[PDB]
Design a binder for this molecule. Structure first.
Ligand code: CHL
Ligand code: CHL
Ligand code: CLA
Ligand code: CLA
Ligand code: CLA
Ligand code: CLA
Ligand code: CLA
Ligand code: CLA
Ligand SMILES: CC1=C[C@H](O)CC(C)(C)C1/C=C/C(C)=C/C=C/C(C)=C/C=C/C=C(C)/C=C/C=C(C)/C=C/C1=C(C)C[C@H](O)CC1(C)C
Ligand SMILES: CC1=C[C@H](O)CC(C)(C)C1/C=C/C(C)=C/C=C/C(C)=C/C=C/C=C(C)/C=C/C=C(C)/C=C/C1=C(C)C[C@H](O)CC1(C)C
Lengths: 198, 150, 41, 207
């Protein structure tokens, strides 16, 4: 039957519904063209994946710190000082590696055949067939990458991004932390809302 | 940047001073509790606020005593040019992109000119918010951006 | 009247559009006057 | 289910063709031909229904000044000036909360206007369902528990006409109260009493 992001409305035509997480949601027709759609599907994946870790990375330590199990600076603060090596060195390193591993999945996107060359010696390869869903060592546990299973990944990613969007905006204006923001709201919600803050 | 910041410019202070005295002079004829007086006192308060912001936002001033803008790209003055500009190009791009979305929707139709002099407002309202993501015009450019016939 | 709607959306569409724009611009200014720069960043 | 020998607002006149008489509350009144075309009309009918229903709730607003004037109660605050009050959490917050629920309510009715279905479901429990056919008559337990809504034409028409007529009356009422306060700067009921005391000199003119 498919899911309607909007009940009354109808889904667009290029959305077959053969895609995980498809609810007929393209009001601006960004994915009318199929190529754009493929690209966007891949993009949603990754934007969604980084957001997952990021939201998790950002949120959990804040929670644990309040519990007192450990002490770490708030995410918007990990940046200043206190690391073996400077900020610059990490960057260049981050860049070299990220540059390689991507300028990397990109090849698999244009033409799906970049699974060999592992390691430099060619003994090991990746066997499978969906873009943005690599196999092999990538999936040590071999969970069935069932369609519907993919539905869950996307939902989390979509959710993560609203959270991420929330964290950053919330940070400004608030000047505090998400968990903190939560405590303030929790302590007295009717008196703590975007309304009292803005 | 041969100028001096406005916060520390004597000429910039003399202008705020001279302006307020001019408006205050007019204040005399109207007496106190009065409509013009409140109107003039509101201009005076609007005047103080103006100069206050310019100094507050680190804008240099010239020997003339008036702020001057740096558009070189210098980071301290993006507010002066670059930030507003990007804002513009976003809107300009928006308007143009929506305008071009309408003509393409209109082109293959009946009498195309009929909808150029009499707007299809349902269609326009459908296409206006597409400009929000107009810089994904770039992805049209990778394929169907412009006509090959010419 | 369909037709009345039709008189509208002619160059009256321009004036209704620009009058709305003028209003919006005016209110913005009334709210944020004398702005020579974008200071929020 | 058209009646052409129906009473008209203008007894002598001739009603417009679009005003068929099938609809409830049809007295053949559209001098400006606003309902001139079917598409516009359906929309107008729904709008009137809503205005009428909302106006009727508003009429209750007239109701409270009655008890406060004599019976008493905590409803003493005039409807006028009612908004600028300190109860609970501040008004603005309240409004924001209201916007979300009611939005869902219409971002709700709207789908129904555009379509014929969506009643078909309770999103959380896709089985509660509920159905009433016809437009601004959702039906179901939430909106029609007693179920007097479902019935037969003639009966439905009669009942429905009653809904609209009270509404039109209610609408003038509410507007009358708002104007009444400004021109008189008082309570409506006070206006009511005052009028009775001296209907001869107590009118718009009195002021
Ligand atoms: C990936 C996303 C990413 C994002 C969103 C940010 C965001 C931020 N960094 Mg960060 N960084 C990111 C990646 C990286 N940073 C750094 C290194 C730093 C440093 C060294 C600093 C920041 C700082 C900051 C913050 C500036 C505060 C502000 O404007 O408050 C409104 C801001 C939260 C500043 C900070 O932490 O200030 C307290 C800061 O000094 N970042 C590195 C490696 C060098 C990154 C590598 O990917
Ligand atoms: C839905 C219909 C509705 C109507 C007809 C009114 C009408 C009115 N309100 Mg409300 N309000 C309504 C909804 C709401 N009001 C408010 C919140 C307020 C406030 C906070 C105030 C009003 C006020 C007013 C009055 C302004 C008088 C004026 O414009 O004089 C020319 C006016 C009687 C003002 C007042 O004091 O009226 C007595 C006022 O201060 N209203 C909320 C948010 C909870 C509403 C939400 O739906
Ligand atoms: C989302 C991506 C993301 C990013 C960019 C970071 C980035 C960072 N983390 Mg975090 N973290 C994340 C997710 C992330 N984390 C998640 C999902 C969790 C589990 C909830 C954590 C739990 C965590 C802890 C407990 C700590 C960090 C710390 C740090 C900082 C030092 C990391 C380091 O030593 O290098 C890696 C080196 C290794 C040897 C590994 C650095 C800012 C440390 C910190 O707060 O600053 C020192 C630290 O205390 N992270
Ligand atoms: C026997 C131990 C061993 C060693 C020393 C390496 C070493 C290496 N592997 Mg390999 N790999 C191994 C086992 C091993 N692998 C096994 C058992 C599998 C699955 C059967 C893979 C699947 C694999 C893939 C897909 C890739 C590598 C790649 C690489 C190179 C860098 C990226 C990386 O860290 O790993 C990952 C590096 C030379 C990368 C590479 O060679 O560049 C393309 C890479 O693409 N490996
Ligand atoms: C005349 C030709 C010319 C051109 C094309 C530029 C262009 C630029 N300048 Mg430069 N500049 C020039 C002359 C010029 N400048 C002269 C004669 C001086 C002497 C003062 C400077 C002093 C200067 C400074 C101090 C800075 C620049 C910066 C910049 C960059 C700002 C835009 C940006 O942030 O990225 C684009 C942003 C988006 C697209 C969003 C841009 C590349 C800034 C820069 O280095 O960028 C980081 C900056 O810090 N310029
Ligand atoms: C008839 C005279 C009249 C009067 C008394 C007002 C009064 C007001 N206008 Mg309106 N306006 C008018 C005519 C008028 N306007 C006309 C003819 C147009 C063009 C059709 C507009 C278009 C307009 C816009 C777009 C806005 C207003 C807004 C406002 C309010 C400012 C809200 C605030 O708190 O500031 C501060 C707000 C911050 C965010 C800081 C204020 C109540 C603002 C408003 O309340 O939004 C609904 C708003 O942005 N007006
Ligand atoms: C993903 C983005 C997205 C967006 C922007 C919306 C937006 C909306 N949804 Mg949808 N929805 C979504 C995803 C989304 N949905 C998904 C993934 C599902 C599951 C398939 C649904 C299932 C769903 C149902 C069942 C309903 C909506 C409804 C609505 C409307 C409610 C209006 C409202 O909240 O009150 C006002 C809020 C203010 C802030 C003002 C609103 C237009 C309701 C509707 O009927 O709208 C027409 C409704 O009943 N949504
Ligand atoms: C005179 C006013 C009036 C009349 C005659 C009707 C009549 C009708 N309504 Mg309506 N309704 C009204 C006002 C009215 N309504 C108002 C003000 C609202 C908004 C609150 C609604 C919201 C509404 C919904 C959502 C639905 C109806 C439906 C119906 C039909 C169902 C059965 C029924 O008659 O209800 C009872 C008739 C009465 C005269 C009730 C007596 C007055 C009450 C008990 C006084 C309450 C005391 C007050 C709080 C003080 C019927 C034609 C339903 C329908 O058509 O089927 C789907 C439908 O679902 N109504
Ligand atoms: C779909 C569509 C289509 C139609 O048609 C139209 C429309 C509607 C327009 C649309 C839209 C949509 C949207 C909105 C999207 C969005 C998204 C997002 C937000 C993302 C994010 C996303 C996000 C992301 C990635 C993020 C990430 C992050 C991270 C990792 C972080 C990390 C970190 C950490 C840990 C810690 C520290 O201390 C900090 C840092 C370093 C920082
Ligand atoms: C155009 C035309 C054309 C054609 O063809 C012909 C003809 C038909 C003639 C025409 C006309 C018509 C008309 C006149 C209409 C009107 C209407 C109205 C008045 C309504 C109201 C209406 C009204 C309404 C809704 C109202 C409502 C109200 C309400 C809810 C209220 C609420 C409240 C209350 C209670 C109390 C509190 O404390 C406050 C408040 C909260 C405020």
């Amino acid at each position: 039957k498919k899911g309607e992001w909007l009940p009354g409305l109808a889904s667009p035509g290029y959305l077959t519904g053969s895609l995980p997480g498809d609810n007929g949601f393209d009001p601006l027709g960004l994915a009318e063209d199929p190529e754009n759609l493929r690209w966007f599907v891949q993009a949603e994946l990754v934007n969604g994946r980084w957001a997952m870790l990021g939201v998790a990375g950002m949120l959990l330590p804040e929670v644990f710190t309040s519990i007192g199990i450990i002490n770490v600076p708030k995410w918007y603060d990990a940046g200043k000082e206190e690391y073996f090596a400077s900020s610059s060195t990490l960057f260049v390193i981050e860049f070299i590696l990220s540059h390689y591993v991507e300028i990397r999945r990109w090849q698999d996107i244009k033409n799906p055949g970049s699974v060999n060359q592992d390691p430099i010696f060619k003994q090991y390869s990746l066997p499978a067939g969906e873009v943005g869903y690599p196999g092999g060592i990538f999936n040590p546990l071999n969970f069935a990458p069932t369609l519907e299973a993919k539905e869950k990944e996307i939902a989390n990613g979509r959710l993560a991004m609203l959270a991420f969007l929330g964290f950053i905006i919330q940070h400004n204006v608030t000047g505090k932390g998400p968990f903190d923001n939560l405590l303030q709201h929790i302590s007295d919600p009717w008196h703590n809302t975007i309304v009292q803050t803005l | 940047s041969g100028l001096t910041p406005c916060k520390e410019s004597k000429q910039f202070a003399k202008r705020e001073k001279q302006s307020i005295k001019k408006l205050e002079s007019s204040l005399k004829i109207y007496a106190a509790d009065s409509a013009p007086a409140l109107a003039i006192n509101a201009t005076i308060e609007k005047t103080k606020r103006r100069f206050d912001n310019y100094a507050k936002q680190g804008l240099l001033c010239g020997a003339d005593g008036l702020p001057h803008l740096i558009v070189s790209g210098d980071q301290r003055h993006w507010g002066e040019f670059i930030t507003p500009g990007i804002l513009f190009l976003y809107i300009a791009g928006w308007i143009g992109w929506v305008g071009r979305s309408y003509l393409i929707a209109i082109r293959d139709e009946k009498k195309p000119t009929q909808k150029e002099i009499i707007i299809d407002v349902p269609l326009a309202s459908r296409l206006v918010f597409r400009g929000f993501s107009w810089p994904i015009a770039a992805y049209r450019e990778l394929l169907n951006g412009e006509l090959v016939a010419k | 009247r369909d037709l009345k709607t039709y008189l509208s959306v002619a160059p009256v569409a321009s004036t209704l559009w620009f009058a709305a724009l003028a209003g919006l611009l005016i209110e913005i200014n009334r709210l944020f006057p004398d702005a020579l720069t974008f200071p929020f960043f | 289910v058209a009646e052409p020998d129906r009473p008209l607002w203008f007894p002598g006149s001739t009603p417009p063709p679009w005003l068929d008489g099938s609809l409830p509350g049809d007295f053949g009144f559209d001098p400006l031909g606003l309902g001139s075309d079917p598409e516009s009309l359906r929309w107008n009918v729904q709008a009137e229904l809503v205005h009428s229903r909302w106006a009727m709730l508003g009429a209750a607003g007239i109701f409270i000044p009655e008890f406060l004037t004599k019976l008493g109660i905590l409803l003493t605050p005039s409807w006028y000036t009612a908004g600028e009050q300190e109860y609970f959490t501040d008004t603005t917050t309240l409004f924001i909360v209201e916007l979300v629920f009611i939005g869902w309510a219409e971002g709700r009715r709207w789908a129904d206007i555009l379509n014929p279905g969506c009643v078909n479901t309770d999103p959380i429990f896709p089985n509660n369902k509920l159905t009433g056919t016809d437009v601004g008559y959702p039906g179901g337990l939430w909106f029609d528990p007693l179920g007097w809504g479902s019935a037969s034409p003639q009966k439905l028409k009669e009942l429905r006409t009653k809904e609209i007529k009270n509404g039109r009356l209610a609408m003038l009422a509410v507007m009358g109260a708002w104007f009444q306060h400004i021109y008189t700067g008082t309570g409506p009921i006070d206006n009511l009493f005052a009028h009775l005391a001296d209907p001869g000199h107590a009118t718009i003119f009195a002021a």
